[PDB]
């Protein structure tokens, strides 16, 4: 459902226009040829035209392939990259990886193979690309490419550019409702901040906070912040749509009230990752709660609400007595110091929840008041029943331990500590991170489960598109394929050639 002349709004520049951009882009391998989802593409064309340096793209692609095998396998899946990339006589054979390090390689796979085998090679691999290839890419026309694409990136957002639907939810501060992108047919979530509610609270920094740690964050299970722009009357937050309702409803709507153990194992284990993704930026969440673990429509869950999300400063610690009733870590409730303890507290809120069905603090069937619940959070140790495995009892008890010093992943080593706990120890996480373990509940897609003082305040909020989002957006929509095209037989196209404009 794209726009009639969506091929005239993202006509490409021609290359003489993106001389500024050439100029003040950080020329970072790992930026331009990885992280950046166009620019790692630009870069793997160019090498897929070079014989010499192809079969190193394929090579890191089968590694990837291997980090996922299953265990089984893997004896398998290692004996094939070695006897393909690695012996000297191959169609493929790469020689950046010094002969000593392919001597190293294969004795491991005469012991028991590791997931991590080919850590060593790929590593070697990337540093042969971080330069002489990397620099060569640089003075050829796919990063040419690159420049017109960025420049599209950096183009203003208004509210032409979205086509809004209907509101999906609503809130304190204004509405969400759900947003298309009419160039390229993405759907989002146009969560809209009214700006007359802002400017009586006076939550500017409450807002700001809330859009900088979106647009910082790039997770597979977090809410990526995809556009920040300005309209009359109200900001709005373009965010990821999810329309698998939420797991609240999940657990007491279509549950026993609550799951089976392996089933909030799968819940659980990707609330982890996420959280681990908002702790690389030492941003702690402090709003862990069922309602704002979101379901997408292939059944995977993310992180929503980051209105009560912090950016702690390195070796600092914040104070703040906030959050939901019964989901509040004691060290939040005497209002002490605090870093990121709150959030494998409301972790173990959350699998105890899920497996048992209530709260651990307060019965389904039960009604006390605010400061009762308090108290047990503070003082009562909590009980589990036969609906726990042993495994499943420990983590719930360790994520449970009021005190945040003993508490499980409030130690340096973060949230590794909590995915080699037993509970975790069928999860095999890097087939999770790379989406290829089957949720255990698919969401059918007909279902529905539900002044020039403020200026400068929203010049720093109505930043304009995120580049990893809107790159992704491009990419997913088939924009990136459709439009990146060249001269027949390997030549410049015309918007590519600096002679006839
Ligand atoms: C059902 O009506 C439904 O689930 N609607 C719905 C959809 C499709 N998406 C959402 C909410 C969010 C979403 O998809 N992504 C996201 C990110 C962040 C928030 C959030 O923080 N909301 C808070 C409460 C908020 C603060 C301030 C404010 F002004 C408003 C909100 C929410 C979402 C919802 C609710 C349905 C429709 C089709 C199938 O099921």
């Not at 556009?227 to 709507?253: P, Q, R, S, W």
């Not at 982890?272 to 673990?293: A, Q």
Request: hydrophobic letters at 35%.
């Amino acid at each position: 459902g794209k726009s009639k002349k969506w091929k005239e709004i993202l006509k490409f520049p021609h290359i003489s226009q993106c001389e500024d951009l050439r100029r003040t882009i950080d020329r970072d391998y790992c930026s331009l040829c990885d992280k950046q989802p166009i620019g790692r593409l630009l870069f793997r064309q160019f090498c897929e035209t070079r014989p010499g340096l192809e079969c190193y793209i394929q090579f890191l692609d089968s590694v990837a392939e291997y980090e996922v095998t299953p265990d089984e396998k893997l004896g398998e899946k290692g004996k094939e990259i070695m006897t393909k990339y690695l012996t000297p006589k191959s169609p493929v054979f790469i020689a950046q990886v010094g002969q000593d390090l392919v001597s190293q390689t294969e004795e491991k796979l005469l012991q028991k193979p590791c997931k991590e085998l080919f850590s060593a090679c790929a590593q070697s691999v990337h540093e042969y690309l971080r330069g002489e290839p990397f620099h060569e890419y640089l003075d050829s026309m796919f990063f040419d490419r690159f420049l017109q694409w960025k420049w599209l990136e950096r183009q203003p957002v208004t509210k032409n550019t979205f086509r809004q639907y209907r509101v999906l939810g609503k809130g304190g501060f204004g509405e969400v409702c759900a947003c298309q992108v009419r160039a390229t047919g993405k759907m989002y979530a146009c969560k809209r901040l009214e700006k007359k509610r802002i400017k009586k609270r006076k939550g500017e920094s409450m807002a700001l906070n809330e859009k900088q740690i979106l647009e910082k964050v790039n997770s597979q299970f977090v809410v990526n912040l995809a556009y920040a722009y300005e309209t009359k009357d109200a900001l709005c937050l373009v965010l990821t749509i999810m329309n698998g309702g939420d797991l609240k409803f999940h657990i007491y709507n279509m549950g026993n009230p609550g799951f089976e153990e392996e089933r909030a194992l799968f819940y659980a284990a990707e609330i982890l990752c996420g959280l681990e993704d908002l702790h690389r930026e030492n941003t702690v969440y402090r709003n862990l709660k069922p309602e704002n673990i979101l379901l997408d429509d292939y059944g995977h869950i993310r992180i929503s609400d980051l209105g009560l999300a912090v950016k702690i400063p390195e070796g600092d610690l914040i104070r703040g007595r906030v959050g939901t009733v019964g989901y509040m870590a004691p060290e939040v409730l005497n209002n002490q110091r605090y870093g990121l303890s709150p959030d494998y507290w409301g972790l173990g809120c959350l699998i105890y929840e899920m497996i048992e069905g209530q709260s651990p603090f307060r019965g389904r069937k039960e009604k006390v008041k605010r400061e009762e619940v308090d108290r047990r959070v503070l003082e009562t140790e909590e009980v589990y029943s036969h609906k726990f495995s042993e495994e499943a009892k420990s983590i719930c008890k360790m994520l449970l331990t009021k005190d945040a010093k003993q508490r499980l992943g409030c130690q340096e080593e973060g949230a590794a500590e909590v995915k080699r706990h037993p509970f975790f120890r069928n999860m095999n996480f890097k087939r999770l991170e790379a989406g290829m373990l089957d949720p255990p509940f698919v969401p059918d897609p007909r279902a529905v489960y539900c002044d020039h003082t403020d200026d400068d305040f929203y010049s720093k909020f109505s930043t304009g598109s995120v580049s990893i989002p809107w790159q992704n957006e491009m990419i997913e929509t088939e924009c990136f394929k459709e439009l990146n095209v060249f001269g027949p037989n390997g030549t410049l196209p015309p918007d590519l050639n600096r002679n006839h404009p």
